[PDB]
Amino acid sequence: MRQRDDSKRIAFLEATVREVADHGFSATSVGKIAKAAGLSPATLYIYYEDKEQLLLATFYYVSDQVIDAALDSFSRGKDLREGLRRQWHTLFRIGLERPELFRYHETFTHSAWMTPEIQARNESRAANLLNAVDQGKQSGLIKPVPFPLLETFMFRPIYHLVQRCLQGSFEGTDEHIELAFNMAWDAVADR
């Protein structure tokens, strides 16, 4: 059955997330992922050619889960600010509950496994979000600034604050998450 195949794939994907988040890429072998998933390496090779391919499938599994949830939340907002606000809360919750997804993404994107094609693929999946933000630049809602700046003030602070919350230097209350969003919005909002 397909459902059995998918269950096994999810086991390997989740195992790779945990192992790499705890130990990094180098220390994490095919053998170790398989053992963490509770399956044999022979079974791993039925689904993934090699380590490289499983690390990339895992990157897409992590990225798609996060992007899809963000997009779903964003789609419920009646205007750009509300959409971004709903997405922000959603991403904060994902980071607080599944920080390993954030850590896998971060480790991957800053490694030699990352490529422009991989970035473009995730950008394409996040299209509805990115195009909405671009359209806010055109309409005078969002400062007409290069994207690196928008990323710095509207996306990156979520990662940083989730880390501080989990390390005990900030309390991840709904009130504090909203305050942070308010600040991200003010940063990017055209005056």
Next chain:
Amino acid sequence: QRDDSKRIAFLEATVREVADHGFSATSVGKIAKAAGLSPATLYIYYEDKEQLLLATFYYVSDQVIDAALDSFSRGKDLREGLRRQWHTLFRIGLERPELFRYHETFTHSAWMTPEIQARNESRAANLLNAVDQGKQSGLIKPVPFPLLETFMFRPIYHLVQRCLQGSFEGTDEHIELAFNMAWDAVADRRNT
């Protein structure tokens, strides 16, 4: 004076080696070698690795905090002070990113303690007290300090890194625009 110079050689070698290879890989011997001096010489000034790493953290922090305080004090008001400090910090990151990396590596390590934190907050008191007053006066949003750190200081580190990796151009104009965004993030909008 000549004492300050041998010391500087060791402190700078510590900054370079740790920034490049991390703490665990950096021994007294490699720091001494990087400095062009013997471990026996190193031990004249620093008792062991622990003490050299701490002294290096204070050297890095003092260099940066003092430059920031100096620039902040030339501002004609709070916003101008923060804008000048921002430009000075961004320039320091561009020229000496190893200072930022040493600070980051150390603060995110087991060597870091609340007492060390407090000592740096103390040296920076004039800035932090002015920012705190701004939180009650209508200038700065009355939010927890970790949010102020997130939107007013951390973006300098992130943008410096992007500049050095080629994903952002660190022109005077761009540095100013980024500060305007950071200010908008932290600034209390009541009455405007």
